[PDB]
Amino acid sequence: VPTGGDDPTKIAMLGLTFDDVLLLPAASDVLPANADTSSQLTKKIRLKVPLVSSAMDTVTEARMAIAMARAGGMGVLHRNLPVAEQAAQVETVKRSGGLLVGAAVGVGDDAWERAMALRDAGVDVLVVDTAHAHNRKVLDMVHRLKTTVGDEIEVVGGNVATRAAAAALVEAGADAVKVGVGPGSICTTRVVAGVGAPQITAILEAVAACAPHGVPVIADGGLQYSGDIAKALAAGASTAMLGSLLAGTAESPGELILVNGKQFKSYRGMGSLGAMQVPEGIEGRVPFRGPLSTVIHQLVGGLRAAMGYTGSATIEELQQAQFVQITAAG
Amino acid sequence: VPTGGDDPTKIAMLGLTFDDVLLLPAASDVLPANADTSSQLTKKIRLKVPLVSSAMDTVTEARMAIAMARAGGMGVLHRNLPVAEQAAQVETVKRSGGLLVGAAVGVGDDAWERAMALRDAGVDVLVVDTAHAHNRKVLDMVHRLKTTVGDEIEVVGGNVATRAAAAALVEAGADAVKVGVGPGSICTTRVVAGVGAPQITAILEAVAACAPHGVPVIADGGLQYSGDIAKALAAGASTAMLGSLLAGTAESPGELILVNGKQFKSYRGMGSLGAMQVPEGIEGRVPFRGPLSTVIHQLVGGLRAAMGYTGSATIEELQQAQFVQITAAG
């Protein structure tokens, strides 16, 4: 073994991230304005725009969830607050019309009671929200929700970064699988635990387990540019979840911060000291970006451009596009 | 598949850019001063110097086109202006003697009328100027021009970054194929759409489709140093198109800008907000470089040095040179 030892499987794969690849152009009869950007969030739920906002307390509360749904995507309400307040935020979103909304739950002692309160409030999607879903407690939670409320509510499980973990969630009854261990902009899992998987390889592996069973993959974490959304979907994901890219918008929680003459908003990991009060997230800031509607317009515009370049009339066609791998000289 | 999934073709190639390679020296009887730098711009048109200026409104109007032709190359007049004005710039170049000139046209509603006005003004080369030529509308335009005015005017099509796209332009009747999707210094296609192809690999692939049919390849975008011109031609291109390297010259459009005691000129993508008024270009500045004649002298001097090192008496011999691939430690 050229990298050491006598076991070829010790280093099991070469992991690629978004910056390691570009989409290859292909023959196209598709104009960006004419592409169809709709895609499955879950087995049953299709979004007009393949984007969902992160379940984070500096990204998604009712205002963001309402704005995301109006824009054609969806928000996932964070769970760092009392059950009653989270359920009230679901109701608030529903007071603004026939808008889709999701909400995060954990696997702890109060997670089931949280899920039932969200159900009663009319939530459309429950996201079982963990850093590592390949665990009997997480799989049991997904299965029990699906068996209990799965006729009326779609159940998402995550996060995973391997084929086997994705397969386990599929077996448990997940209506979608969320992919990303380590890639988030505010994440320190890779430095604290030394654990992770580069996101393009993680998506390719998860899709190999999920697509044969008709289960969509949500690419969660590490997206920095609109072009990364196109790369995530071309790797086989059906939607992308965004934290950093949406945290600086008017509709996110938090106030404006002025630093050296420039405007910022606070953005922090849910595993940061601040959010919890051994952290696996940090607390920082991102530039202020203005209204959500305008950010989504630019992100979808980039996606539409990719669809034009690759000849993809639909997201399902984009999922079949090819990559070229690039070097550091990039 | 070591990088993920079960499909070896998902990542279709490893893309190299200029900074990934160096030309290997070889046995030489060639002195730099004695090398022949002439090369085909198109099937019928040979230039004394294998360089053409970009069709950009901060690079090529009549002054630059005149200077480029006098230097042994050619300019391609930009099309971000009324048809009458572009045709008048062609006439202005012709008032300065028997000088070659090209001009860009699009594929939109007024593109045909633009092409005919340029024809009437005495243009030598029409460049069908798109970000992605592998499209029936672009191919049809190339073919219709070739069939209509192709006895008197050479028709260039672009841009492409793949073998199949190059082959399609050849089939459509292109007299030259222009290569470059994503590599321009002011380009944001790779970050906005996530689409592109590293330029050495793009040229190698395009040449594999074009050279067997006797169609020259124009390497367009990403050239930063004179040595990059030699690399582009050794990869098989017949000429190089330059934007950034020529934008800071006296002959480019625009005035001098003084910033922190240094001199600059404005340089912007034609897909930038400023040029258009979802942008795929930015607006910036490059250092002021003085007269065009002096810049071309240094660029051709570097090319001549490469020809001496590689034993290439002609550009056709340089196209057969070999590379060594280098690492980040470079």
Place this chain on the structure above:
Amino acid sequence: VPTGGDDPTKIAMLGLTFDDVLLLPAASDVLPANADTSSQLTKKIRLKVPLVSSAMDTVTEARMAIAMARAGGMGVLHRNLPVAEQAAQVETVKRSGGLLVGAAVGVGDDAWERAMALRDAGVDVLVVDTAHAHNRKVLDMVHRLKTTVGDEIEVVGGNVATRAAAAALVEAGADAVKVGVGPGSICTTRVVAGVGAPQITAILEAVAACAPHGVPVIADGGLQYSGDIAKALAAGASTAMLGSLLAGTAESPGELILVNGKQFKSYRGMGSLGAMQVPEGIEGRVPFRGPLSTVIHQLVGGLRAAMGYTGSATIEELQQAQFVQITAAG
């Protein structure tokens, strides 16, 4: 041979360091709080926490050794001081209860007398401390100690970076093998001598020689984050030795230094000019980190997180985890 010459063995391997890999998550029934972090320091000695402090005069004297043992690890007392003083530091550690302690010896003229004084003071572990243990003088020292005092004292040999060197120490009777040639944060062996081995590959190779004989490997040098400890153990090491990560703690030797409003402590290589008075170490500073107990808590917390993600109930299970190799885009 693609990299030059006609001998494929001239470049014998591709060396990976900590930053080249990540641990892959795997199926887990392990909660971080419930993982067992104990591991063999030597054949006979098991630590509660798999961490030992470097034998350096800016890291380990009696205060650090006492604190490390109380925290569940061990200190190795440095040998840059008179024999009588080093032996007195061993006695000081013993005055604080039933605490494990190690101490470094060289192979020079006074090394044997040093070892016997340490023996008489009640040392538990003797570390034969060299930059390159694959040498008859070092191997003889290890063997002679083992034959003379090996019933009452565990004998560690190092350092090595190759399989053959590790095998030689095992043959000589080493109770543990310490791995690391070149990777230390204050080390200049790689720039001065041009010699070294990236630490993940060095550990994989040393473990291939040591594990079949039941001899634990101590990963020494280059660890910068808690996640690196998990990577070192997953590569097959049984403990990690830390210098930089512990040098800024209250318990290390040296006073606080104030620079530009921030607090630091001095940290220097034992091969630096300062320590010796052709240096192979430098003298610098690291941020002040507060009490040792708190640093160890965060480091072990990260290790525990890795054990949870990889489904490792014990360190022996963690040694079987798998990696993904990452690119520069990381």
Place this chain on the structure above:
Amino acid sequence: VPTGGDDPTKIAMLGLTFDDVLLLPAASDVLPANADTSSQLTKKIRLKVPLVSSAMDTVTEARMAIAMARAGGMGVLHRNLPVAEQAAQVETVKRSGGLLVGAAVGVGDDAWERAMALRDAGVDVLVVDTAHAHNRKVLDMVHRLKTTVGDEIEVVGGNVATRAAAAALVEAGADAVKVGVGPGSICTTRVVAGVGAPQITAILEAVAACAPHGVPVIADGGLQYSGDIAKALAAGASTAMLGSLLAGTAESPGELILVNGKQFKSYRGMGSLGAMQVPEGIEGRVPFRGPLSTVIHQLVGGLRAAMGYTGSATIEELQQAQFVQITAAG
């Protein structure tokens, strides 16, 4: 072909530089102080220290040549001065005892007359000094010198970066071959001409042509640290030529320059505008380093350390050492 086109030989090799590799330690009975650092400069001339100073007007005139010879190496006098003055510098070196000295000549009109004046002055080594020796004019010069004065004077030819070029110089009668196209610290050949070869691969290839014929290789350019000297020799070179590493010494030409409170000396390429008055070198400065004797002591000290780590008793044994290739994470 994964990198483009249909020709696997277009990219002929993967080129490694010094920073791409480390020397592997091996079993050693060698103490640094006891290693033998002597090595062949040419077929007939053996140096005590395997180092020669560059033929540059900011590195080697008589003072440096005298100091280098006294230190056990040799200087090569630059040729950017009248023939009479260069010959007088040779005589000056000879007035200081039985000291070896070399001198550069070109291949131009006055090169033969220069060589004969140097011969008459008692030069020991003539270096045919070109950027690309694979050329009939350079090969003819080497052969004619060897046939004319080769009984009394050793004739070095260079520079080369390929096996075939090295073989040609050997055939022409070279007593040593100097390797390096593009790697010099002040060199811009790689950016101006786009031509070069990473130096470890260049040495491995040149040695494959030279060693079978008993012709030593001089590694010239790109050495930044003492460890690079050990790497160059382990790749198979017999000596190293140094420019940058010696330009800041007291014995180099030029005065002290004070910039922002620090001391520097001027260092410039012989192909820079300043030296010539299309440049392939730049003009800059390097830190002042003090006496040559002290710099050589540190460089040889690093070499001696490498010999100890690799178990190399002699330079011929070091030439058989092995490498590990490292990544960017290095």
